[PDB]
């Protein structure tokens, strides 16, 4: 007459936060995730909870490097 | 034993798509594609009625003589996409072929004759792969059952294969297995 | 070859009972052995 379940946790709002070709500031976090689904690419660092962030200003762009999806920051030219 | 190619007419599909295919299929026509070493996938509508008629007369595996706008080509049926329910042929695949050309194919195997009465004959593989020329392709080949002894297996390696044709399947593929007819106290004992 | 952890190992003189002389090395602190049945004594070794 009772359900032995009915509990869940809060949604953590994970996922890609900046997509390809998007200009970011240095320090912006770019994708929140659990494991390493996206590996840190060139000029992109990885946080303690596996959060990828940008170590330099530029444009986001994804890639594959030896069978590993990677995220990179590309230096846009100064006008 | 050369098999005479069957003469169909075809004409190049003006424009492609699911709408075009549905319309053509609605006008009693089959969309098909030529390919092979002709290196040109050529999109051809052909008469549905004549296609079905020649497939009845000479099975799935039969050479055709396609008349493409006057040009004359030899073709061989590679595959037929058929609806599971309405059973109409939807699409056809046509390798281009010429004389003296070995080609791999799958030929139906129809058990012929009556068996010994106390047991039933049952085929596991109805089709056997053979390597054979374009014209010399057998539409069907038979396997012998004439009062077998008690239950025994038959494989592709002991079939009377035609001349000019070569077995492709591994010889130890079972085709027809005579299995003892279930008794009264054995038939309803399986299935639950 | 560690410093001293292994057991003592020196050259040893081994003499058979039937007259064979073996020039060997073992861990015998003495370094001297005499054996009465050897490779030339057993019936299986030399067929006797």
């Amino acid at each position: 007459s009772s359900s032995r379940n009915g509990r869940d946790s809060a949604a953590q709002r994970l996922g890609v936060k900046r997509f390809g070709g998007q200009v970011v500031k240095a320090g912006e976090i770019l994708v929140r995730q659990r494991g390493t689904h996206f590996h840190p690419g060139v000029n992109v660092g990885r946080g303690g909870d596996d959060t990828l962030f940008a170590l330099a200003p530029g444009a986001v762009e994804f890639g594959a490097k030896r069978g590993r999806k990677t995220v990179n920051i590309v230096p846009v030219a100064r006008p | 034993t050369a098999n005479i190619p069957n003469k169909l007419t075809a004409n190049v599909r003006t424009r492609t798509g699911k709408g075009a295919s549905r319309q053509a299929r609605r006008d009693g026509k089959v969309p098909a594609v030529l390919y092979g070493h002709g290196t040109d996938p050529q999109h051809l509508e052909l008469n549905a009625r004549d296609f079905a008629a020649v497939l009845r007369s000479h099975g799935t595996n039969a050479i055709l003589t396609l008349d493409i706008e006057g040009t004359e080509q030899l073709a061989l049926t590679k595959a037929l996409d058929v609806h599971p329910i309405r059973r109409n042929i939807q699409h056809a695949d046509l390798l281009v072929v010429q004389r003296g050309e070995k080609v791999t194919v799958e030929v139906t195997v129809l058990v012929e004759g009556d068996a010994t009465p106390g047991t039933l004959v049952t085929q596991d593989a109805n089709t056997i792969e053979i390597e054979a020329e374009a014209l010399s392709i057998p539409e069907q080949l038979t396997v012998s059952v004439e009062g077998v002894e008690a239950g025994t297996q038959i494989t592709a390696g002991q079939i009377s294969l035609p001349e000019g044709v070569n077995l492709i399947s591994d010889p130890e593929l079972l085709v027809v297995n005579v299995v003892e007819a279930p008794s009264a106290e054995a038939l309803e004992e399986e299935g639950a | 070859m560690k410093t001293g952890i292994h057991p003592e190992y020196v050259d040893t003189t081994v003499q058979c009972g039937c007259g064979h002389s073996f020039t060997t090395r073992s861990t015998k602190q003495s370094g001297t052995i005499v054996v009465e049945v050897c490779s030339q004594c057993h019936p299986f070794y030399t067929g006797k």
Binding site: - | I85, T122, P182 | -
Partner: protein
């Protein structure tokens, strides 16, 4: 009755019962078969009745292949109860059938007896089916 020995999850959603059978639409084991024409939930009750019907009709020697398996459980909450208090306990088993899928297949010497046993089976099913032969 046909019951799976275990299912990873014992309370699933109702099987989506749309589309045409893509897999399992040909007669391969025996020579004659029963091939479906409507979406339904063929329970193991229907399958057992149909199989016994075929066996009763042929009754001598011939192979019946039930190439569908009832392994999807439909639950039912106990009677006289209101809505709520969670999902019920599973208490019948089902195969999800699409129009196109050969349900039963038969191997038997003659023609008419085989056809009659197949239609005897068909009458026990909640759908329209048709007898289909080993050839195009």
């Amino acid at each position: 009755m046909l019951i799976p020995r275990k299912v990873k999850h014992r309370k699933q959603h109702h099987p989506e019962q749309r589309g045409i059978a893509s897999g399992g639409t040909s007669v391969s084991f025996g020579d004659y078969g029963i091939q479906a024409l409507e979406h339904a939930y063929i329970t193991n009750r229907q399958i057992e009745s149909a199989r016994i019907a075929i066996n009763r009709h042929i009754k001598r020697g011939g192979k019946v292949w039930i190439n569908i398996f009832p392994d999807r459980p439909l639950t039912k909450k106990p009677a006289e109860t209101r809505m709520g208090s969670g999902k019920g306990s599973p208490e019948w088993w089902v195969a999800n059938v699409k129009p196109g899928r050969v349900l039963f297949e038969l191997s038997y010497p003659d023609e008419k007896t085989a056809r009659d046993a197949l239609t005897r089976a068909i009458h026990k099913l909640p759908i329209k089916a048709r007898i289909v032969t080993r050839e195009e």
